[PDB]
Design a protein around this ligand. Sequence first.
Ligand SMILES: *[C@@H]1O[C@H](CO)[C@@H](O[C@@H]2O[C@H](CO)[C@@H](O)[C@H](O)[C@H]2NC(C)=O)[C@H](O)[C@H]1NC(C)=O
Ligand SMILES: *[C@@H]1O[C@H](CO)[C@@H](O[C@@H]2O[C@H](CO)[C@@H](O)[C@H](O)[C@H]2NC(C)=O)[C@H](O)[C@H]1NC(C)=O
Ligand SMILES: *[C@@H]1O[C@H](CO)[C@@H](O)[C@H](O)[C@H]1NC(C)=O
Ligand SMILES: *[C@@H]1O[C@H](CO)[C@@H](O)[C@H](O)[C@H]1NC(C)=O
Ligand SMILES: *[C@@H]1O[C@H](CO)[C@@H](O)[C@H](O)[C@H]1NC(C)=O
Ligand SMILES: *[C@@H]1O[C@H](CO)[C@@H](O)[C@H](O)[C@H]1NC(C)=O
Ligand SMILES: *[C@@H]1O[C@H](CO)[C@@H](O)[C@H](O)[C@H]1NC(C)=O
Ligand SMILES: *[C@@H]1O[C@H](CO)[C@@H](O)[C@H](O)[C@H]1NC(C)=O
Ligand SMILES: *[C@@H]1O[C@H](CO)[C@@H](O)[C@H](O)[C@H]1NC(C)=O
Ligand SMILES: *[C@@H]1O[C@H](CO)[C@@H](O)[C@H](O)[C@H]1NC(C)=O
Ligand SMILES: *[C@@H]1O[C@H](CO)[C@@H](O)[C@H](O)[C@H]1NC(C)=O
Ligand SMILES: *[C@@H]1O[C@H](CO)[C@@H](O)[C@H](O)[C@H]1NC(C)=O
Lengths: 49, 86, 95, 320, 118, 46, 37, 99, 50, 37
Amino acid sequence: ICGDSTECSNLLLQYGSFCTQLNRALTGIAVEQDKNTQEVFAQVKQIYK
Amino acid sequence: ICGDSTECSNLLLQYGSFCTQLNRALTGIAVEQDKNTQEVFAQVKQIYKTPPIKDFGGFNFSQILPDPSKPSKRSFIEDLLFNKVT
Amino acid sequence: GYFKIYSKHTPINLVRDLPQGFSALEPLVDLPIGINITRFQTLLALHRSYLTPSGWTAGAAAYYVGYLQPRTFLLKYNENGTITDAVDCALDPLS
Amino acid sequence: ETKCTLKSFTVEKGIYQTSNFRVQPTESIVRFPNITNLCPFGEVFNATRFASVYAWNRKRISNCVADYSVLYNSASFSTFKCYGVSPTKLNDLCFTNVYADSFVIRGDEVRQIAPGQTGKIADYNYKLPDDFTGCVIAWNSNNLDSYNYLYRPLQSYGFQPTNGVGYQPYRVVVLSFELLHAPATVCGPKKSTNLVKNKCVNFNFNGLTGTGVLTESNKKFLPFQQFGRDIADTTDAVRDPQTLEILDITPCSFGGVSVITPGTNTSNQVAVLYQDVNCTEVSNVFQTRAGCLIGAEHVNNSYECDIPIGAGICASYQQS
Amino acid sequence: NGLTGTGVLTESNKKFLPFQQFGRDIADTTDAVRDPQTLEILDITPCSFGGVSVITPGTNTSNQVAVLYQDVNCTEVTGSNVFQTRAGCLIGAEHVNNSYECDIPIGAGICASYQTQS
Amino acid sequence: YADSFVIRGDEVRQIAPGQTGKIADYNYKLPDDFTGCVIAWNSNNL
Amino acid sequence: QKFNGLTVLPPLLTDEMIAQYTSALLAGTITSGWTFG
Amino acid sequence: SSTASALGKLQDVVNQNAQALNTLVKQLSSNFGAISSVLNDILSRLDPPEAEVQIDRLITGRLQSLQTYVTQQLIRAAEIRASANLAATKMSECVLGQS
Amino acid sequence: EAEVQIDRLITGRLQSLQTYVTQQLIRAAEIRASANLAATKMSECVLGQS
Amino acid sequence: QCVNLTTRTQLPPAYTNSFTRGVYYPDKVFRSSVLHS
Ligand SMILES: *[C@@H]1O[C@H](CO)[C@@H](O[C@@H]2O[C@H](CO)[C@@H](O)[C@H](O)[C@H]2NC(C)=O)[C@H](O)[C@H]1NC(C)=O
Ligand SMILES: *[C@@H]1O[C@H](CO)[C@@H](O[C@@H]2O[C@H](CO)[C@@H](O)[C@H](O)[C@H]2NC(C)=O)[C@H](O)[C@H]1NC(C)=O
Ligand SMILES: *[C@@H]1O[C@H](CO)[C@@H](O)[C@H](O)[C@H]1NC(C)=O
Ligand SMILES: *[C@@H]1O[C@H](CO)[C@@H](O)[C@H](O)[C@H]1NC(C)=O
Ligand SMILES: *[C@@H]1O[C@H](CO)[C@@H](O)[C@H](O)[C@H]1NC(C)=O
Ligand SMILES: *[C@@H]1O[C@H](CO)[C@@H](O)[C@H](O)[C@H]1NC(C)=O
Ligand SMILES: *[C@@H]1O[C@H](CO)[C@@H](O)[C@H](O)[C@H]1NC(C)=O
Ligand SMILES: *[C@@H]1O[C@H](CO)[C@@H](O)[C@H](O)[C@H]1NC(C)=O
Ligand SMILES: *[C@@H]1O[C@H](CO)[C@@H](O)[C@H](O)[C@H]1NC(C)=O
Ligand SMILES: *[C@@H]1O[C@H](CO)[C@@H](O)[C@H](O)[C@H]1NC(C)=O
Ligand SMILES: *[C@@H]1O[C@H](CO)[C@@H](O)[C@H](O)[C@H]1NC(C)=O
Ligand SMILES: *[C@@H]1O[C@H](CO)[C@@H](O)[C@H](O)[C@H]1NC(C)=O
């Protein structure tokens, strides 16, 4: 939004924790993509030859 | 958003039906929460009971069967579960 | 355009320097002044010497001075109301 | 209400949330600290010798909550005229400083003080700007005055005991304030009332304007703190600024209301559910976990659920 | 000429046509500029940024920390055995040749753990 | 609706929607929205 | 791609580790049938 | 009874709902560009021409915080309904049968 | 006067970022449905016979 | 009055390191068992 400009960054603090909520949402769907692969492929105890 | 303020409530009518929609959406997912529990647990027609003498071949179900001297008549394992979720 | 003073009196048993605990400096006064301040000093109470061979200079004294700065400090309040543990944010990465 | 909400003339069976319910507050209260100061005003009006305009002195008044109605609503001071802000609105406001001039002019030259006309006493003795000097206060006097006060060219004044009107020896005291730039210092008397408890009131505890009930608290502040705050920043406890007593603030009850229709091809009977509220404070009246239910009789049977209320309680049209 | 901004400047192997004053790719931000005096063409790529992550074993266990600087070749950032990986670079962690079950996922195949002893 | 009255030239700014003062608050109050026009001219001759 | 605020994080299992998983699944269903599950 | 956080799937649903309801109330102390975040203090300190301009900054900010909450509860409830359709299939096919 | 112009850019950019994040939550719930089917198809068809 | 005095000595102002000192109550609000930032 602001991009290295401290006049904008103080005006953005009047909007509460919107940015905080936005970062918390995109991290929850990044951790989820690693669990999506762990459930499909890691279905084996040992490595068979 | 207004909280007992008449000149705030007058300005909010300029937005139309933004808040008839939000109460309708939150009521649609509160009725759904009751349909969720009904479909899991109401799978049985009659309320069956276990016989008072328990000759199950040597198998022991006393920790998963209910307890008649207890709050809510929960089982033993059902009380360890309810004393761990805040 | 204000002037706020915060204070505390604490018993101590260390040899010279600052102890390790926490101090809740509660405010004394606030003075509606509006004066523009940029330099200061401290007052000593020297007494007259008399028939003992200028004639001044009581005792021995020392004080510690250190200047604010802005950061963020988090207070883990008590059930009484008291600030007990203070957290500094820009101290280290762990903070 | 339900038909209006659904915009239809026929409703089907169900339970519909149709409006809200709140207890409206009565008899607002305000509670402010105390008035300890009286203000230095003993040293302006009861002083013996007052000067003239050739040596107009000034007296700064600061750091008080003074008054402005014990010299306006009382009327023995012959001159109470000033402009712009009416003297009924000085008690609710205040600047930074208060200054007091004093001079004694006969009555024929008293009339030239109305800013927009600088006087002979005001062009060469006391500088009157284009803005109005705050107030000019004068009263007739014959105790220690009714001669030896000059002004300005240099001429003396004529004072005696048998001098016709217009020449009276008034006592002109001029009040003016400071730019009030920095934090002010001198307001009027603040205002308090008598507090109530245990009913929904509209309160003001030295700044906190909200609504709620005020019950007595058993909590302990630190001796410098004024109010408490919950998590997510809501004021729950305040301190009574006259009695130093901690009072809890809980919001006076709100909720939703809902109507239980068996449908309008069956009946026009209705039960009403006031959600999570005690019927004690606004057919039979039945108290439930879901709020109390008014218009439905609590039978002691068990059937299948037809219209759900909550926490295990249901309802359906049986002739009631 | 008033086109204020921040970044590093390097010599551009791209060319202009002599009527062109600056350049851009996408989203109105300028990439190249012809300076008013030398009339040389210079690239504007911004000086590096990233995110900072911090790996902890739990305060109940210890008070020690490694720090991950995400997506930055750390010749431009302590000093406790830095280790460049694909997911950034680690500062304060000891690279070993063993292999265990994953404890704390760093990324791109690397995990981190606290065992005997830093 | 044509409404006419005589006012000081200082107070020709006082006849406006959302205005406070002496004449706008104690003599003649235009409402807040006020679809309309305000016409004025000098009368030193009369 | 990184332009301005935008980042792409790397996945925790690389493409070599995922291919080593599907080779151990395929070496058990040839050798052992359905007994390894 | 010895090992806690074995119910970690059920604790995360209770924690996430409380996190979202805590953030709805803390957005009431935001200005959103007005002069004060309390609706009674721009009332007691401004005239109804200028108070209408500041209240319309609080309304637009508080209405956006309530629409963000309802949208995130609509997405989150679609994930619970997927998990309750799975527990209703596991009760048919594995409690009342043998799979 | 810069503040009343910056605020027009803030509310427009904060709305373009929310429209992104809302549509990424809806899209990531479609992948989780399809990565749950791929997990069932490996349990019930690679590790067994269906 | 104004009897000047000072001499000259002073050496290097001895430095030190306060660990955790100087936390004043920045308010009047009363919070109960709740970490506040
Ligand atoms: C079935 O299992 C229960 C375990 O839950 C047994 O109950 C325990 O028995 C021991 C005796 O070996 C007692 O010391 C415990 O106090 C019992 N726990 C209870 C009653 O909660 C029970 O004995 C078993 N029943 C049979 C028939 O073997
Ligand atoms: C407060 O007083 C100081 C004077 O000590 C002002 O600060 C600066 O003082 C230096 C001399 O040391 C001058 O050369 C500068 O010009 C002063 N600063 C400025 C901005 O003029 C300071 O300005 C004063 N503060 C106020 C509000 O007047
Ligand atoms: C002193 O002056 C005040 C004016 O405020 C007046 O009310 C009061 O009566 C005076 N005192 C006496 C003893 O006359
Ligand atoms: C305030 O004044 C009242 C008298 O009206 C007195 O009873 C009370 O103790 C006073 N409190 C303080 C804090 O001065
Ligand atoms: C309910 O209404 C329909 C028409 O609206 C009617 O046909 C039906 O008979 C009604 N039910 C009863 C029990 O009368
Ligand atoms: C409901 O309120 C009344 C009023 O005081 C009280 O007597 C009663 O105990 C309350 N009931 C419950 C269940 O709290
Ligand atoms: C239903 O229960 C109540 C319990 O308070 C009991 O008093 C009442 O008699 C019961 N109803 C009938 C019809 O007996
Ligand atoms: C400007 O001056 C510099 C050296 O001072 C040199 O490039 C040249 O003389 C001028 N460049 C122009 C006019 O583009
Ligand atoms: C520390 O962690 C262990 C396991 O990680 C746990 O059992 C213990 O309760 C924790 N706290 C203390 C004080 O040891
Ligand atoms: C990191 O920097 C070094 C020298 O600064 C360079 O040799 C190396 O190729 C760089 N790594 C990457 C991935 O660019
Ligand atoms: C770890 O492996 C690298 C690469 O094979 C090697 O250079 C290094 O010596 C090894 N470390 C130890 C302790 O053997
Ligand atoms: C000492 O103080 C006097 C004034 O009393 C002054 O003239 C003189 O320069 C000072 N000397 C020193 C070393 O301070």
